[PDB]
Design an enzyme around this catalytic site. Structure first.
Site, PDB file in Angstrom:
ATOM      1  N   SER A  14       0.980  -1.126   0.024  1.00  0.00           N
ATOM      2  CA  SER A  14       0.049  -0.057   0.110  1.00  0.00           C
ATOM      3  C   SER A  14       0.772   1.299   0.010  1.00  0.00           C
ATOM      4  CB  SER A  14      -1.025  -0.019   1.147  1.00  0.00           C
ATOM      5  OG  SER A  14      -0.324   0.396   2.060  1.00  0.00           O
ATOM      6  N   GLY A  18      -2.604   3.712  -3.589  1.00  0.00           N
ATOM      7  CA  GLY A  18      -3.789   2.806  -2.972  1.00  0.00           C
ATOM      8  C   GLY A  18      -3.194   1.533  -2.424  1.00  0.00           C
ATOM      9  N   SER A  19      -4.256   0.654  -2.452  1.00  0.00           N
ATOM     10  CA  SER A  19      -3.843  -0.730  -1.607  1.00  0.00           C
ATOM     11  C   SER A  19      -3.801  -1.889  -2.592  1.00  0.00           C
ATOM     12  CB  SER A  19      -4.844  -1.164  -0.444  1.00  0.00           C
ATOM     13  OG  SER A  19      -4.691   0.097   0.864  1.00  0.00           O
ATOM     14  N   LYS A  35      -6.454  -3.872  -7.173  1.00  0.00           N
ATOM     15  CA  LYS A  35      -5.932  -2.418  -6.565  1.00  0.00           C
ATOM     16  C   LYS A  35      -7.072  -1.328  -6.175  1.00  0.00           C
ATOM     17  CE  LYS A  35      -4.026   1.891  -8.413  1.00  0.00           C
ATOM     18  NZ  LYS A  35      -3.083   2.397  -9.094  1.00  0.00           N
ATOM     19  N   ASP A 135       6.362   8.187 -14.391  1.00  0.00           N
ATOM     20  CA  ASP A 135       6.685   7.653 -13.181  1.00  0.00           C
ATOM     21  C   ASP A 135       7.573   6.401 -13.301  1.00  0.00           C
ATOM     22  OD1 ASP A 135       5.339   6.612  -9.686  1.00  0.00           O
ATOM     23  OD2 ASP A 135       7.117   7.793 -10.231  1.00  0.00           O
TER      24      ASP A 135
END
Length: 273
Positions: A14, A18-19, A35, A135
């Protein structure tokens, strides 16, 4: 039907994304990643051709998830009252590249060449589909350890690719180019190429080249490890302070250091198995 359609396994992790949970699709035991992200935490929104309001990440992923590629494909997605849920491909066995570099240290050039080349192909695929990841870093790259294939993850800070200037950036700072640091302005491709220079350095040296803002804008590259002059030359070109001095993707893939790349399977046999 979400819990009826997927068996949820352990939490993988996480963070800002998010997780993320391990899961399997019930209809055929396909391994997946699940997700979760709270709606409150989503700043960037888009819409689907059919007029549905989804997070921008879903728009971007749909664009890159057609056909085979070095991108983890979005299989499905659900809206809940306070969150969105994404169902994503999960390689097995899998290790992220940050973890791999942390464990093994600096990579042999043959391995870094194979890995770098597959990342280049995946980014080209994204750009062909009108998508900028924004990213690119070791943490956002998964290795399929049996097949020797690299896969890109986390489009949650991405954008549609445009030829005009970007003035927003919610990606990883130390993979961010000097023009962002100095001016809060960058163009997509040249910034992507900066992030690739940072990544190549990381692979061959075992750590990123710059820690603070002052090093990024000074752009002086010091090698901590023994690295070939051809690889040093490619890294230094990608990390040119002026964005217009950086190579195109074509120029990178035509660079002398990039020649005679191993295939994924032979990469896994020699270096991963």
């Amino acid at each position: 039907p979400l819990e009826s359609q997927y068996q949820v396994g352990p939490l993988l992790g996480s963070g800002g994304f998010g997780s993320v949970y391990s899961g399997i699709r019930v209809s055929d035991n396909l391994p997946v990643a699940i997700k979760h992200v709270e709606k409150d935490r989503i700043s960037d929104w888009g819409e689907l051709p059919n007029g549905t309001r989804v997070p921008m990440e879903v728009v971007l992923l749909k664009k890159v998830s057609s056909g085979f590629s070095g991108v983890i494909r979005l299989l499905d997605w659900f809206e809940r009252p306070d969150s969105f849920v994404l169902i994503l491909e999960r390689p097995e066995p899998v290790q992220d590249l940050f973890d791999f570099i942390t464990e093994r240290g600096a990579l042999q050039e043959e391995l870094a060449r194979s890995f770098f080349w597959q990342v280049l192909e995946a980014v080209r695929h994204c750009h062909n589909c009108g998508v900028l990841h924004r990213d690119i870093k070791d943490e956002n790259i998964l290795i399929d350890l049996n097949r020797g294939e690299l896969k890109l993850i986390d489009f949650g800070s991405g954008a549609l690719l445009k030829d005009t200037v970007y003035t927003d950036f919610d990606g990883t700072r130390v993979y961010s180019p000097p023009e962002w640091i100095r001016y809060h302005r960058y163009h997509g491709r040249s910034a992507a190429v900066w992030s690739l220079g940072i990544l190549l350095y990381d692979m061959v040296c075992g750590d990123i080249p710059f820690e603070h803002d002052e090093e990024i804008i000074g752009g002086q590259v010091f090698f901590r490890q023994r690295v070939s002059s051809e690889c040093q030359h490619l890294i230094r070109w990608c990390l040119a302070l002026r964005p217009s001095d950086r190579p195109t993707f074509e120029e990178i893939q035509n660079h002398p250091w990039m020649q005679d790349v191993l295939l994924p399977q032979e990469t896994a046999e020699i270096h991963l198995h």
